Design an enzyme around this catalytic site. Structure first.
Site, mmCIF file in Angstrom:
data_model
loop_
_atom_site.group_PDB
_atom_site.id
_atom_site.type_symbol
_atom_site.label_atom_id
_atom_site.label_comp_id
_atom_site.label_asym_id
_atom_site.label_seq_id
_atom_site.Cartn_x
_atom_site.Cartn_y
_atom_site.Cartn_z
ATOM 1 N N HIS B 225 0.786 -1.212 0.000
ATOM 2 C CA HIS B 225 0.000 0.000 0.000
ATOM 3 C C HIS B 225 0.841 1.295 0.000
ATOM 4 N N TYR B 229 1.792 5.469 -2.295
ATOM 5 C CA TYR B 229 1.985 6.824 -1.804
ATOM 6 C C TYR B 229 3.428 7.334 -1.972
ATOM 7 N N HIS B 376 -8.531 1.453 -11.986
ATOM 8 C CA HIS B 376 -8.242 2.457 -10.899
ATOM 9 C C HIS B 376 -6.770 2.855 -10.947
ATOM 10 N N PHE B 377 -5.841 1.887 -10.988
ATOM 11 C CA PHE B 377 -4.474 2.291 -10.756
ATOM 12 C C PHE B 377 -3.843 2.961 -12.034
ATOM 13 N N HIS B 378 -4.408 2.704 -13.195
ATOM 14 C CA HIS B 378 -3.858 3.473 -14.413
ATOM 15 C C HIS B 378 -4.215 4.928 -14.238
ATOM 16 N N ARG B 441 -8.595 -9.528 -13.995
ATOM 17 C CA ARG B 441 -7.305 -8.953 -14.308
ATOM 18 C C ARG B 441 -6.252 -10.097 -14.545
ATOM 19 N N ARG B 442 -5.119 -9.648 -15.019
ATOM 20 C CA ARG B 442 -3.926 -10.539 -15.225
ATOM 21 C C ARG B 442 -4.256 -11.737 -16.116
HETATM 22 C C1 HAS Z 1 -0.004 6.170 -7.219
HETATM 23 C C2 HAS Z 1 -0.873 4.965 -7.235
HETATM 24 C C3 HAS Z 1 -1.963 4.792 -6.369
HETATM 25 C C4 HAS Z 1 -2.858 5.715 -5.623
HETATM 26 C C5 HAS Z 1 -2.582 7.193 -5.366
HETATM 27 C C6 HAS Z 1 -3.860 5.003 -5.072
HETATM 28 C C7 HAS Z 1 -4.935 5.582 -4.151
HETATM 29 C C8 HAS Z 1 -5.821 4.787 -3.526
HETATM 30 N N1 HAS Z 1 -6.092 3.495 -3.697
HETATM 31 FE FE1 HAS Z 1 -5.178 2.207 -4.993
HETATM 32 N N2 HAS Z 1 -6.229 0.694 -4.354
HETATM 33 C C9 HAS Z 1 -7.156 0.687 -3.211
HETATM 34 C C10 HAS Z 1 -7.507 1.937 -2.530
HETATM 35 C C11 HAS Z 1 -7.060 3.213 -2.830
HETATM 36 C C12 HAS Z 1 -7.451 4.373 -2.041
HETATM 37 C C13 HAS Z 1 -8.583 4.487 -0.978
HETATM 38 C C14 HAS Z 1 -6.833 5.402 -2.572
HETATM 39 C C15 HAS Z 1 -6.870 6.884 -2.192
HETATM 40 O O1 HAS Z 1 -5.627 7.249 -1.553
HETATM 41 C C16 HAS Z 1 -7.446 7.773 -3.272
HETATM 42 C C17 HAS Z 1 -7.813 9.215 -2.788
HETATM 43 C C18 HAS Z 1 -7.882 10.316 -3.794
HETATM 44 C C19 HAS Z 1 -8.954 11.049 -4.120
HETATM 45 C C20 HAS Z 1 -10.181 11.188 -3.234
HETATM 46 C C21 HAS Z 1 -9.021 11.907 -5.367
HETATM 47 C C22 HAS Z 1 -8.673 13.396 -4.998
HETATM 48 C C23 HAS Z 1 -8.656 14.240 -6.269
HETATM 49 C C24 HAS Z 1 -7.635 15.044 -6.615
HETATM 50 C C25 HAS Z 1 -6.464 15.391 -5.662
HETATM 51 C C26 HAS Z 1 -7.742 15.675 -7.999
HETATM 52 C C27 HAS Z 1 -8.323 17.087 -7.909
HETATM 53 C C28 HAS Z 1 -8.439 17.882 -9.164
HETATM 54 C C29 HAS Z 1 -7.848 19.074 -9.333
HETATM 55 C C30 HAS Z 1 -7.146 19.881 -8.252
HETATM 56 C C31 HAS Z 1 -7.781 19.612 -10.772
HETATM 57 C C32 HAS Z 1 -8.673 20.831 -11.075
HETATM 58 C C33 HAS Z 1 -8.168 21.699 -12.218
HETATM 59 C C34 HAS Z 1 -8.894 22.115 -13.242
HETATM 60 C C35 HAS Z 1 -8.297 22.896 -14.384
HETATM 61 C C36 HAS Z 1 -10.406 21.909 -13.359
HETATM 62 C C37 HAS Z 1 -7.608 -0.699 -2.868
HETATM 63 C C38 HAS Z 1 -8.235 -1.150 -1.539
HETATM 64 O O2 HAS Z 1 -8.673 -0.302 -0.755
HETATM 65 C C39 HAS Z 1 -7.026 -1.526 -3.721
HETATM 66 C C40 HAS Z 1 -7.122 -3.020 -3.677
HETATM 67 C C41 HAS Z 1 -8.313 -3.391 -4.544
HETATM 68 C C42 HAS Z 1 -8.254 -4.870 -4.819
HETATM 69 O O3 HAS Z 1 -9.352 -5.510 -4.768
HETATM 70 O O4 HAS Z 1 -7.228 -5.437 -5.196
HETATM 71 C C43 HAS Z 1 -6.184 -0.730 -4.712
HETATM 72 C C44 HAS Z 1 -5.307 -1.250 -5.771
HETATM 73 C C45 HAS Z 1 -4.298 -0.475 -6.268
HETATM 74 C C46 HAS Z 1 -3.265 -1.064 -7.126
HETATM 75 C C47 HAS Z 1 -3.295 -2.549 -7.393
HETATM 76 C C48 HAS Z 1 -2.203 -3.352 -6.606
HETATM 77 C C49 HAS Z 1 -2.245 -4.730 -7.207
HETATM 78 O O5 HAS Z 1 -1.442 -4.937 -8.171
HETATM 79 O O6 HAS Z 1 -2.959 -5.687 -6.702
HETATM 80 C C50 HAS Z 1 -2.400 -0.031 -7.383
HETATM 81 C C51 HAS Z 1 -1.111 -0.218 -8.241
HETATM 82 C C52 HAS Z 1 -3.055 1.143 -6.877
HETATM 83 C C53 HAS Z 1 -2.419 2.307 -6.885
HETATM 84 C C54 HAS Z 1 -2.787 3.597 -6.292
HETATM 85 N N3 HAS Z 1 -3.992 3.728 -5.440
HETATM 86 N N4 HAS Z 1 -4.131 0.864 -6.178
HETATM 87 C C1 HEM Z 2 1.033 2.809 -22.937
HETATM 88 C C2 HEM Z 2 0.639 2.836 -21.492
HETATM 89 C C3 HEM Z 2 0.072 1.741 -20.908
HETATM 90 C C4 HEM Z 2 -0.926 0.846 -21.229
HETATM 91 C C5 HEM Z 2 -1.561 0.746 -22.626
HETATM 92 C C6 HEM Z 2 -1.068 -0.055 -20.178
HETATM 93 C C7 HEM Z 2 -2.039 -1.148 -20.267
HETATM 94 C C8 HEM Z 2 -2.164 -2.050 -19.241
HETATM 95 C C9 HEM Z 2 -3.166 -3.042 -19.202
HETATM 96 C C10 HEM Z 2 -4.273 -3.187 -20.269
HETATM 97 C C11 HEM Z 2 -3.032 -3.702 -18.043
HETATM 98 C C12 HEM Z 2 -3.850 -4.836 -17.585
HETATM 99 C C13 HEM Z 2 -3.256 -6.152 -17.985
HETATM 100 C C14 HEM Z 2 -3.689 -7.365 -17.257
HETATM 101 O O1 HEM Z 2 -4.510 -7.255 -16.093
HETATM 102 O O2 HEM Z 2 -3.502 -8.548 -17.654
HETATM 103 C C15 HEM Z 2 -1.817 -3.215 -17.402
HETATM 104 C C16 HEM Z 2 -1.302 -3.774 -16.099
HETATM 105 C C17 HEM Z 2 -0.494 -2.909 -15.438
HETATM 106 N N1 HEM Z 2 -0.025 -1.677 -15.658
HETATM 107 FE FE1 HEM Z 2 -0.145 -0.662 -17.413
HETATM 108 N N2 HEM Z 2 -0.232 0.288 -19.188
HETATM 109 C C18 HEM Z 2 0.419 1.384 -19.524
HETATM 110 C C19 HEM Z 2 1.226 2.212 -18.864
HETATM 111 C C20 HEM Z 2 1.364 2.017 -17.378
HETATM 112 C C21 HEM Z 2 2.297 2.585 -16.654
HETATM 113 C C22 HEM Z 2 2.956 3.891 -16.990
HETATM 114 C C23 HEM Z 2 2.136 2.140 -15.310
HETATM 115 C C24 HEM Z 2 3.005 2.621 -14.169
HETATM 116 C C25 HEM Z 2 3.667 3.772 -13.974
HETATM 117 C C26 HEM Z 2 1.539 0.997 -15.553
HETATM 118 C C27 HEM Z 2 1.336 0.014 -14.485
HETATM 119 C C28 HEM Z 2 0.691 -1.145 -14.667
HETATM 120 C C29 HEM Z 2 0.707 -2.232 -13.684
HETATM 121 C C30 HEM Z 2 1.184 -2.016 -12.242
HETATM 122 C C31 HEM Z 2 0.016 -3.309 -14.130
HETATM 123 C C32 HEM Z 2 -0.513 -4.514 -13.418
HETATM 124 C C33 HEM Z 2 0.616 -5.574 -13.486
HETATM 125 C C34 HEM Z 2 0.131 -6.823 -12.825
HETATM 126 O O3 HEM Z 2 -1.138 -7.055 -12.572
HETATM 127 O O4 HEM Z 2 0.866 -7.756 -12.474
HETATM 128 N N3 HEM Z 2 0.923 0.816 -16.843
HETATM 129 N N4 HEM Z 2 -1.380 -1.981 -18.039
HETATM 130 O O1 LIG Z 3 -2.579 0.491 -3.144
HETATM 131 O O2 LIG Z 3 -3.781 1.423 -3.407
HETATM 132 CU CU LIG Z 4 -3.398 -0.094 -1.082
#
Ligand code: HAS
Ligand code: HEM
Ligand SMILES: [O-][O-]
Ligand SMILES: [Cu+2]
Ligand SMILES: CCCCCCCC/C=C/CCCCCCCC(=O)OC[C@H](O)CO
Ligand SMILES: CCCCCCCC/C=C\CCCCCCCC(=O)OC[C@H](O)CO
Ligand SMILES: CCCCCCCC/C=C\CCCCCCCC(=O)OC[C@H](O)CO
Ligand SMILES: CCCCCCCC/C=C\CCCCCCCC(=O)OC[C@H](O)CO
Ligand SMILES: CCCCCCCC/C=C\CCCCCCCC(=O)OC[C@H](O)CO
Ligand SMILES: CCCCCCCC/C=C\CCCCCCCC(=O)OC[C@H](O)CO
Ligand SMILES: CCCCCCCC/C=C\CCCCCCCC(=O)OC[C@H](O)CO
Ligand SMILES: CCCCCCCC/C=C\CCCCCCCC(=O)OC[C@H](O)CO
Ligand SMILES: CCCCCCCC/C=C\CCCCCCCC(=O)OC[C@H](O)CO
Ligand SMILES: CCCCCCCC/C=C\CCCCCCCC(=O)OC[C@H](O)CO
Ligand SMILES: CCCCCCCC/C=C\CCCCCCCC(=O)OC[C@H](O)CO
Ligand SMILES: CCCCCCCC/C=C\CCCCCCCC(=O)OC[C@H](O)CO
Ligand SMILES: CCCCCCCC/C=C\CCCCCCCC(=O)OC[C@H](O)CO
Ligand SMILES: CCCCCCCC/C=C\CCCCCCCC(=O)OC[C@H](O)CO
Ligand SMILES: CCCCCCCC/C=C\CCCCCCCC(=O)OC[C@H](O)CO
Ligand code: CUA
Lengths: 31, 554, 166
Positions: B225, B229, B376-378, B441-442
């Protein structure tokens, strides 16, 4: 007042709610 | 160059960024093939003609995950969260240690890449036992991640040297960010370090017959997790302390920026059982307690949302924008360093909404291990973090190299960041929707083309995204190489100050700032919270281990 | 002006943060609610239940798939399921509609998923451990089990079937 920042946090609220209540409804539907 | 003699930290920072972007490019080559696959189109034969060492979809997916989400993100975090505080304080990092951290990362990477490339560790970036990769993948990876302990030392050193020279001054903003961030990382990293030393390494070497898969996943997600961050916070440091200047305004609150980072320090690590909602052998009370605490880890990004939006709005108003939308239109949309983090923050709104879903315990049973998760994570790492780093090509690179960005290169960077953003949004749609339809997935689902008929519609989105992102990736490679191998060098660009924002004028709340500066204390709080949230479960698991035999199923 | 914009920003930020907190609290209450209902039966048993993956196909409740379904209450059946490379036994799992089913699932090899399409059943299957989850099928018919945890090259075609009899 920061009307623009509020408009952003409104979109964010509505998004969060649509996602959360959407999935909650799916959860019960599959229960 | 006389610039690298005075700021040798520029060269080491450049080496981290370059190697980071090379991993991103390599790992990203597989992403379009994977989006096509999730669009039910099988392009692996083409990929295999082009890259004949690729034996399977799942070897491609291991590479993509490790290179992009592990290697690229870490190298970026090491570049940004060392160089920025060093420039803010105007002090030289310990250069012996900086280079040691680089070579540890490079060597760790090279050693892990060998078995990955040879099809000896097709276990994905989570490497869950009992799937058993080659020892070199675990050793290369361990050394790669341990590079970051050096970085932590580097920054704590800077901070301490500065505080010695400035007794009773509060920590400067970017340095406060980086200090809490690297201390958070230290406490976060212990899960994987324990998992690797206590289990994975003795196991892959042949020292112990099996590993207990439940203990291994628990210690994995202690780190898994907070690592996200750790990916995110370098982009946040830029978004708070640099973007407001690029937008043409100021950061509207220094204390609210510090408070978000302190909330990340306290709440990033004790929440990992939200990756284990579907695991046996973890008590559901403790799942609920991580679910609540995960909802709390959301609050600093909810706070960021407002502080950052209000900073952008303030900039738009300074630049003449009026209405309820005029402020948006008035912002510097011709500047890729502005545009890229802004678009990444827009996609982070759905990205964070899906994370809050995933966090919600029983709601996770709807989406867990489905395509929703990659959806979510993309949005979070492959869009916001990646776009923010891409936008750094456009202020950070010239600052490190003295190499000018041309008008043509600027416009090309605009097109790259827009296509990359839009491709990530389209794929987010295809993956969230396929996930709600139970597509796992995967999975090389293109090899079972009749298994998912209900997903026909979002599948078109994934094909489209795979093509749009192929084009964005090709243009990015072309652009990065144009800017890297570029002719001209203007030494003044490397000597110009970083574009750090001023903070809006107003009291503010000293005492809150002083209170948050009590870093030793806040760190012990963070660390107590981890003993509280993990201790009781890990006592039980370690007292009832059940190791099991390893498998190679590829 | 800057003084005034800053004041106003912090004031409305305080308001957003309270609202955003309120909202998160409602979600926490709504999750609490699911945990008190029958829908929470898919949450796996917390208690550790250790087995040996190397002998599970030779001795114990997974060794004879035709005996996998055991009536354990007047409206309750326990089903012993093996998820393995790359399949589920028994195949099909046959259970009566409207009965409570207690699935006890383990693996003799690697981690598999066990995701029953159309339900909230979605559980990781770890070799050496038994995953126990509970569900009552309201509608008769065929339900597909999808393996949703990468378990090797046969992963994308690893499916099984639950038939819920009228
Ligand atoms: C950098 C990457 C990551 C962030 C950040 C991230 C944030 C969260 N995630 Fe996540 N996530 C989960 C919960 C959350 C929660 C509650 C949040 C929070 O921290 C999110 C809070 C953020 C917000 C509430 C959005 C705030 C909005 C902002 C700050 C934008 C504002 C817009 C502005 C300022 C623009 C305005 C400007 C204009 C011009 C209009 C959960 C479980 O609770 C799973 C497991 C699910 C499962 O079944 O496997 C999960 C799975 C993942 C995986 C899969 C791991 C795997 O391979 O199995 C990754 C890689 C990932 C990454 C990331 N996640 N997450
Ligand atoms: C051209 C850009 C990209 C595309 C088209 C792409 C597409 C995908 C797709 C379709 C999946 C799902 C595959 C599966 O569940 O079997 C995947 C998995 C993933 N992608 Fe990307 N991806 C891109 C760029 C990114 C980059 C920039 C990040 C990180 C900085 C990233 C992180 C991941 C990770 C963490 C996984 C999951 C690996 C796993 O389950 O074991 N991807 N991506
Ligand atoms: O790890 O969201
Ligand atoms: Cu997490
Ligand atoms: C600047 C980058 C943006 C790039 C945007 C790219 C848009 C993709 C093409 C759309 C035209 C429609 C073409 C579709 C026509 C053929 C469809 C088809 O044959 O389907 C695939 C095949 O069946 C599978 O095996
Ligand atoms: C500035 C940033 C803005 C970002 C905002 C992005 C958030 C998208 C949210 C919701 C889309 C939902 C689409 C409509 C809901 C679909 C529900 C539906 O049709 O459900 C199927 C039902 O079972 C009948 O068959
Ligand atoms: C812009 C890029 C961002 C990507 C945006 C991702 C879109 C996913 C959006 C919302 C999820 C809401 C869940 C939809 C729930 C609809 C189904 C419903 O309402 O459930 C009742 C039905 O009977 C049950 O079977
Ligand atoms: C594998 C091990 C080789 C490690 C090779 C390390 C080369 C180190 C070069 C370096 O960064 O150190 C500067 C040094 O003083 C010279 O100029
Ligand atoms: C420093 C460089 C290398 C460390 C040397 C590590 C070499 C240890 C080799 C052990 C090994 O490969 O044992 C595999 C066995 O089949 C059980 O999985
Ligand atoms: C870099 C970190 C590498 C970790 C490798 C070796 C460290 C020491 C491992 C000590 C070996 C203990 C194995 C042992 O005693 O095995 C018990 C066996 O499972 C019951 O018979
Ligand atoms: C402030 C930090 C929050 C800390 C405390 C937060 C709330 C935890 C309380 C009770 C959990 C009850 C959960 C029990 C659910 C079991 C469901 C079941 O029996 O599944 C079949
Ligand atoms: C399936 C989903 C795919 C679609 C995804 C789209 C989501 C939102 C689209 C764009 C965000 C950009 C918002 C702001 C753009 C502002 C540009 C502007 O105002 O330009 C001013 C003018 O150029 C003087 O600078
Ligand atoms: C009907 C929907 C069709 C699906 C979309 C097809 C995808 C991409 C088209 C390419 C768009 C490239 C966008 C470029 C915008 C750009 O570069 O804007 C600079 C600008 O002035 C502000 O920053
Ligand atoms: C965002 C920009 C627009 C993207 C995609 C257009 C939507 C495409 C939806 C068309 C459905 C195509 C399809 O495959 O239809 C389903 C099924 O085959 C029926 O028999
Ligand atoms: C000029 C730039 C804009 C051009 C971009 C288009 C904009 C959005 C719409 C459609 C693209 C769809 C492309 C998908 C191509 C093939 C789909 C496919 O594989 O079809 C499956 C079918 O449903 C099973 O028979
Ligand atoms: C040694 C581990 C150091 C981690 C603790 C950091 C907090 C700390 O030591 O605070 C006092 C500071 O050194 C005064 O400038
Ligand atoms: C079912 C749920 C309903 C969803 C519908 C969307 C709700 C709107 C969202 C956020 C409001 C956040 C902003 C709170 C404004 C606080 C007022 C305030 O702080 O005002 C002080 C100022 O000094 C005045 O004089
Ligand atoms: C200042 C005003 C403050 C008051 C505002 C409070 C917010 C109300 C929101 C949610 C309450 C929770 C409702 C709990 C009932 C959930 C019932 C449900 O959804 O039932 C599911 C299923 O049909 C059966 O198994
Ligand atoms: C922009 C984003 C657009 C998002 C669009 C969202 C569409 C969600 C659809 C379905 C979820 C509902 C799942 C309900 C489960 C019931 C399935 C069922 O009946 O299962 C088979 C059973 O065997 C029969 O006998
Ligand atoms: Cu079994 Cu994937």
């Amino acid at each position: 007042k920061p009307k623009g920042a509020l408009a952003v946090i409104l979109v964010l609220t509505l998004t969060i709610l649509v996602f959360w209540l959407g999935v909650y409804a799916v959860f019960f539907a599959r229960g | 160059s006389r610039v690298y003699e005075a700021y040798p930290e520029k060269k080491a920072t450049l080496y981290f960024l370059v190697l980071g972007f090379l991993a991103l490019i390599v790992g990203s080559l597989f992403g379009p093939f994977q989006a096509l696959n999730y669009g039910n189109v099988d392009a692996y034969p083409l990929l295999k003609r082009l890259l004949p060492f690729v034996q399977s979809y799942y070897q491609g997916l291991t590479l993509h995950g490790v290179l992009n989400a592990i290697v690229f993100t870490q190298l970026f975090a090491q570049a940004i969260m060392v160089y920025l505080p060093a420039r803010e304080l105007n002090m030289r990092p310990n250069m012996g240690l900086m280079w040691l951290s680089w070579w540890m990362a490079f060597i760790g990477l090279v050693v892990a890449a060998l078995p990955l490339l040879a099809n000896e560790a097709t276990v994905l970036y989570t490497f869950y036992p009992p799937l058993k990769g080659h020892w070199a993948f675990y050793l290369g990876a361990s050394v790669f991640v341990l590079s970051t302990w050096v970085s932590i030392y580097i920054v704590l050193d800077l901070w301490r040297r500065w505080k010695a020279a400035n007794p009773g001054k509060v920590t400067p903003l970017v340095t406060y960010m980086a200090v809490v961030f690297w201390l958070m990382w230290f406490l976060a990293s212990l899960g994987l370090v324990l998992e690797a030393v206590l289990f994975l390494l003795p196991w892959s070497f042949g020292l112990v017959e099996g590993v207990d898969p439940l203990v291994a996943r628990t210690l994995f997600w202690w780190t898994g997790h907070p690592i996200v961050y750790f990916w995110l916070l370098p982009a946040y440091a830029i978004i708070y302390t640099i973007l407001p200047k690029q937008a043409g305004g100021k950061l509207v609150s220094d204390p609210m920026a510090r408070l978000a980072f302190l909330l990340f320090l306290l709440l990033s690590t004790p929440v990992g059982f939200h990756h284990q909602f579907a695991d046996p052998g973890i008590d559901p009370t403790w799942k609920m307690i991580h679910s609540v605490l995960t909802l709390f880890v959301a609050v600093p990004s909810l706070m960021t949302a407002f502080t950052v939006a209000a900073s952008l709005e303030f900039a738009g108003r300074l630049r003449g924008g009026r209405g309820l939308f005029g402020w948006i239109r008035a912002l510097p949309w011709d500047n890729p360093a502005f545009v890229a983090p802004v678009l990444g923050l827009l996609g982070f709104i759905p990205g964070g909404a899906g994370g809050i879903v995933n966090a919600s315990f029983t709601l996770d049973y709807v989406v867990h291990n489905t395509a929703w998760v990659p959806g979510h994570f993309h949005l979070q790492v492959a869009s916001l973090v990646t776009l923010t780093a891409m936008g750094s090509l456009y202020w950070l690179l010239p600052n490190l190299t003295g190499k000018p960005i041309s008008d043509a290169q600027r416009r090309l960077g605009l097109a790259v960041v827009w296509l990359w953003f839009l491709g990530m949004m389209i794929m987010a749609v295809g993956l969230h929707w396929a996930g709600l339809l139970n597509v796992p997935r995967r999975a090389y689902i293109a090899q079972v083309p009749d298994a998912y008929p209900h997903a026909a519609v979002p599948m078109v989105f994934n094909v489209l995204a795979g093509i749009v992102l192929l084009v964005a990736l090709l243009l990015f490679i072309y652009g990065l190489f144009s800017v890297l191998l570029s002719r001209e060098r203007k030494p003044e660009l490397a000597e110009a100050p970083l574009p750090f924002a001023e903070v809006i004028s107003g009291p503010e709340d000293r005492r809150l700032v002083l209170a948050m500066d009590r870093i030793g204390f806040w760190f012990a709080v963070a660390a107590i919270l981890v003993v509280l949230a993990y201790g009781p479960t890990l006592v039980q698991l370690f007292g009832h281990l059940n190791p099991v035999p390893g498998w190679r199923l590829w | 002006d800057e003084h005034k914009a800053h004041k106003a920003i912090l004031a409305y930020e305080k308001g957003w943060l309270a609202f955003s907190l309120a909202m998160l609290f409602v979600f926490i209450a709504l999750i609490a609610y699911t945990l008190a209902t029958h829908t929470a039966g898919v949450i796996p048993a917390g208690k550790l239940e250790r087995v040996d993956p190397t002998t599970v196909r030779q001795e114990g409740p997974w060794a004879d798939p035709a005996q996998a379904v055991v009536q354990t209450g007047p409206n309750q059946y326990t089903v012993y399921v093996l998820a393995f490379a790359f399949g589920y036994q028994p195949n099909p799992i046959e259970v009566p509609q409207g009965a409570e089913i207690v699935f006890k699932i383990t693996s003799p090899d690697v981690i598999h998923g066990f995701h029953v399409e159309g339900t909230n059943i979605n559980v990781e299957v770890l070799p050496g451990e038994v995953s126990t989850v509970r569900y009552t099928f309201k509608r008769p018919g065929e339900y597909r089990i999808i393996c949703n945890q990468y378990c090797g090259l046969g992963h994308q075609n690893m499916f099984g079937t639950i038939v819920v009899k009228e």
